[PDB]
Design a binder for this molecule. Sequence first.
Ligand SMILES: NC(=O)c1ccc[n+]([C@@H]2O[C@H](COP(=O)([O-])OP(=O)(O)OC[C@H]3O[C@@H](n4cnc5c(N)ncnc54)[C@H](O)[C@@H]3O)[C@@H](O)[C@H]2O)c1
Ligand SMILES: NC(=O)c1ccc[n+]([C@@H]2O[C@H](COP(=O)([O-])OP(=O)(O)OC[C@H]3O[C@@H](n4cnc5c(N)ncnc54)[C@H](O)[C@@H]3O)[C@@H](O)[C@H]2O)c1
Ligand SMILES: CSCCC(=O)C(=O)O
Ligand SMILES: CSCCC(=O)C(=O)O
Lengths: 327, 327
Amino acid sequence: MPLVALLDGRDCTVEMPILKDVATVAFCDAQSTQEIHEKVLNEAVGALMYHTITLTREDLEKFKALRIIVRIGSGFDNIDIKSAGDLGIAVCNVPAASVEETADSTLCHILNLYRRATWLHQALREGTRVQSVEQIREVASGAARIRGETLGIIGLGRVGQAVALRAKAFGFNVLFYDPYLSDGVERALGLQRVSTLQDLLFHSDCVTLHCGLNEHNHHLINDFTVKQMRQGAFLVNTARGGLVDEKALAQALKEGRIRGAALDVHESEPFSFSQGPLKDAPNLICTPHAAWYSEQASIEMREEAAREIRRAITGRIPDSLKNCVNK
Amino acid sequence: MPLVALLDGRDCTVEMPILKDVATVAFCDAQSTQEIHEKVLNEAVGALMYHTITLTREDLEKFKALRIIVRIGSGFDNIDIKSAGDLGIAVCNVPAASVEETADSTLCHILNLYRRATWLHQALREGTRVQSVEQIREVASGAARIRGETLGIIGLGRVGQAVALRAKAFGFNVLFYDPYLSDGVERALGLQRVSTLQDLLFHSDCVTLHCGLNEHNHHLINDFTVKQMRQGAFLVNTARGGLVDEKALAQALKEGRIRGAALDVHESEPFSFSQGPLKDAPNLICTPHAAWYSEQASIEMREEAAREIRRAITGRIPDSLKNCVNK
Ligand SMILES: NC(=O)c1ccc[n+]([C@@H]2O[C@H](COP(=O)([O-])OP(=O)(O)OC[C@H]3O[C@@H](n4cnc5c(N)ncnc54)[C@H](O)[C@@H]3O)[C@@H](O)[C@H]2O)c1
Ligand SMILES: NC(=O)c1ccc[n+]([C@@H]2O[C@H](COP(=O)([O-])OP(=O)(O)OC[C@H]3O[C@@H](n4cnc5c(N)ncnc54)[C@H](O)[C@@H]3O)[C@@H](O)[C@H]2O)c1
Ligand SMILES: CSCCC(=O)C(=O)O
Ligand SMILES: CSCCC(=O)C(=O)O
């Protein structure tokens, strides 16, 4: 039976009943390609993977039998996809399993910035006593009324759309910028669209990222673009860490140009509050790439991924695949 | 000019331009009646107050000239209202200034329980390193998919309604219980209504409190009713601390019968994580009675309160009052 390897993990229990009579399944628990056994590189026909390992062209060439990579999850910036296709390797993803989880975590982050719940909780853990109204106003200082505020969405695909719909219900005015959609989706969903990133950032009280990370948007938020954002704007990122220059973000937080930021993703993951450019930044909320996570979403995407592998092996690449992203 | 006293605060700057030519304004910065100067008790014609001081009949009798109490805010459980009216004292509130602030903080709490953002942030502050997917699943364990879950709302007045509308947008199935509304409001807003508290608690995955605290609902949530809630249900309280028996809540958190609770209000305020029945309870998020707070809401309710005082003094009690709650 063909070999299929789980690259950056150990647990295969969900995939096993689907793949039993179809593939031999192995895991590598690998943080990098230098940690994969020679057998896998030599023999693996398929590969399952998350976001915690990167495949450059170098890495892909080390595989001598590999015909399919399936990401367990939606983002595939961590695979050099064009090179994979040149090397005759089909790459797929799982686009839909965690859309609402991610939108809900996004809304949770937005609300946490506006209503300061996480910071107020921290404050209480720290032993701050809040006895008088005056003290409530001070400890909660910066907490703001949402109705009439403008949420700017960068990228209006699955998550951005789920986010927009939720945001309307709190009285946000929602703008988006997405240079790759054909026109009319703004009408369909009753949103306002803007042509440029700069228009979005200029008009937005809270800016939230929901685009894939691609060759053209590394450090989309940087020293230049940060300077285009409203004074005292919020920033939210549950998309990809590489869309933001943490050095510019940090300075901006220190200087108060950005009032607060909520980040589930980071340039270098795992994230620590003790290492990197963000080390000392005030007004920062962070989560460990967990916006996607629910038990149902985890199970859902694992089973769909397993099936995609099965379809690869059992049928015809790339015809038998539902979610190949480099045909 | 008549004397008007701000009882449990110092700052009068917002009220002053409205009350200048109408009343002499004083403050008491009082946590209790035993802290108010004799002049105020003797002469005060009106009183402005928050939630941090209580007026029993005893306290109200100590006032010899007092004709109006205006709460700066909506909840008036902290004033013995019936006795005030007997003693010839008009009591008013400010019902509308912070409805959406409170609904938004409520949604923030709900989402924080389901998506664990606050706890995940804490975790990162504590130096937990979350490198692998397996580690993400463990640190985020308990994070759940919202669509199809049931939110049970107890009290469907202003805040409960704003909460319900927001919750629909995340795919919550919304039930409410409110024994004082006439029928049909459920149809108007497209919700499901249940007849008893027990029906609500039985069917609800997350239970959220939005009723006034009154003579009939002290410890609404207690040893008995806690036992009626779903196993692993969440509880949210931005209403009043006295609706919940923290002793039963605590045990329930320890035993895992309630999976998590988010509390902006508490039996004894200010709240400390080092004192009281909740001291050791796991899975607890808390905020220092700040759900109401935004700068606009604060200003809004202060100006409206001031005007109500002005209307009291300038015109006819109780006819000239917009928000007298004991006519
Ligand atoms: N934190 C998490 O756990 C988590 C979970 C799910 C998705 N994500 C990330 O969030 C991203 C969004 O997810 P999705 O499912 O909505 O993806 P999607 O493909 O459905 O939508 C992405 C949208 O971004 C747009 N876009 C691309 N580049 C852009 C740019 N420079 N400016 C503006 N718009 C741009 C595309 O046109 C597309 O409409 C994913 O790529 C993924 O990496 C993170
Ligand atoms: N944490 C905060 O900062 C904050 C802010 C605003 C309000 N609050 C509190 O939340 C409460 C709700 O605010 P609101 O403006 O919606 O009040 P509201 O008067 O508009 O609505 C309260 C509703 O609760 C219902 N009710 C009363 N007793 C009940 C019971 N035993 N079971 C079920 N329903 C019951 C009433 O019928 C009413 O419809 C207020 O009384 C206030 O104390 C807290
Ligand atoms: C199962 S990890 C996936 C998380 C993610 O960020 C993505 O897929 O886009
Ligand atoms: C301005 S404090 C008011 C807060 C509150 O809980 C209420 O008014 O109901």
